[PDB]
Design a binder for this molecule. Structure first.
Ligand code: 7QQ
Length: 342
């Protein structure tokens, strides 16, 4: 009943013991994160004299080979980030400790899902949203550098962490799934709530899919609730449809998974398959955001920066972020030139 000389468990994770000293450098504190890759522990670095976060990868090749890709991309971003300006988490260093690859990241604070849960999923200010929304568009602008051309492939509130708990400066984490621009190798990508139409429809994808995810996330930050909370892909696409309407024909004519959601009638047009949902395009984001009704649930009425003009700019930007066509969907650079930010 032993595995890796008593260091590992049956799940191939490391057994995190509190106060364990590592390599005469790192003092382990407590397990904080957990997932497919392995575990993530909080620890104190003796040399740099600071709190760091050591992402402990599982002791098997599947997870180890995926982690060295995460490293390869983390380091390549840190080469171009230099003066840490573009809101990418800093991979300080990495090493092997008892057959576990460990990635040492700067200690961040609470993620954006933690903020939602602390507001009982009522959301945060449009003004705080703007800050995250700008910082995120800069990060996506950074990832769109031709040399990088990095797609995160998994953006959501829990992969966006604040640097300091008192400040709104953010950092994006987890590039374990990060797709660097290429050919269509993968299909079932992104988390479901934030999964683009081109991914759902089984079409090619590029860096535009992170922009879609950003749109969903930004709306989720202000309302407090996921914009498209589908139980499955068909429900997911239906929830997108009832807000944004039927995807254009020219997109669906190419979509290999179009018949999973839509019918091609003899007419040649596209309509929904049967199954609870309002007609296409009727649950308008204007009504969801509460533009003319004092914000989400009328809770922002009277607050500064939450006027109809402020809500119109925010709504307009989100609609561009949620463009069905990935080619006309707003790019990071143009998104930052939007009124909402000025
Ligand atoms: C909570 O502090 C951190 C800092 C960097 C990373 S990187 C990482 N990896 C994940 C969340 O999959 N988690 C953290 C957590």
């Amino acid at each position: 009943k032993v595995y890796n000389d008593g260091y590992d468990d049956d799940n191939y994770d490391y057994i995190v013991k509190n106060g364990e000293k590592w390599m005469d450098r790192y003092e382990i504190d407590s397990l904080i994160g957990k997932g497919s890759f392995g575990q993530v522990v909080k620890a104190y670095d003796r040399v740099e004299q600071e709190w760091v976060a050591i992402k402990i990868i599982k002791n098997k090749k599947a997870f180890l080979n995926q982690a060295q890709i995460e490293v390869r991309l983390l380091e390549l971003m840190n080469k171009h980030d230099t003066e840490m300006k573009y809101y990418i988490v800093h991979l300080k260093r990495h090493f092997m400790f008892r057959n576990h690859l460990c990635l040492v990241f700067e200690m961040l604070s609470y993620n954006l899902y933690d903020l939602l849960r602390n507001t009982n999923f009522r959301g945060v200010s449009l003004n705080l949203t703007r800050k995250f929304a700008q910082q995120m568009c800069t990060a996506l602008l950074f990832l769109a550098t031709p040399e990088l051309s990095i797609i995160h492939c998994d953006l959501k509130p829990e992969n966006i962490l604040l640097c300091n708990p008192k400040r709104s400066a953010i950092k994006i984490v987890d590039f374990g799934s990060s797709c660097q621009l290429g050919q269509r190798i993968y299909q079932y990508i992104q988390s479901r709530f934030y999964r683009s139409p081109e991914v759902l429809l089984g079409m090619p994808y590029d860096l535009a899919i992170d922009m879609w995810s950003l749109g969903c996330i930004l709306v989720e930050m202000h309302t407090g609730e996921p914009l498209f909370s589908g139980a499955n892909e068909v429900d997911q696409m239906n929830k997108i449809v009832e807000v944004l309407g039927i995807p254009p024909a020219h997109i669906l004519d190419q979509a290999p998974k179009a018949r999973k959601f839509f019918e091609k009638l003899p007419d040649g047009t596209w309509n929904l398959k049967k199954t609870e949902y309002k007609p296409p395009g009727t649950r308008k984001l204007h009504n969801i955001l509460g533009v003319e009704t004092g914000g989400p649930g009328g809770r922002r009425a009277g607050e500064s920066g939450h006027t109809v003009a402020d809500y119109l700019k925010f709504k307009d930007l989100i609609l561009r972020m949620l463009d069905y066509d990935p080619k006309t969907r707003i790019q990071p650079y143009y998104a930052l030139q939007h009124s909402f930010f000025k």
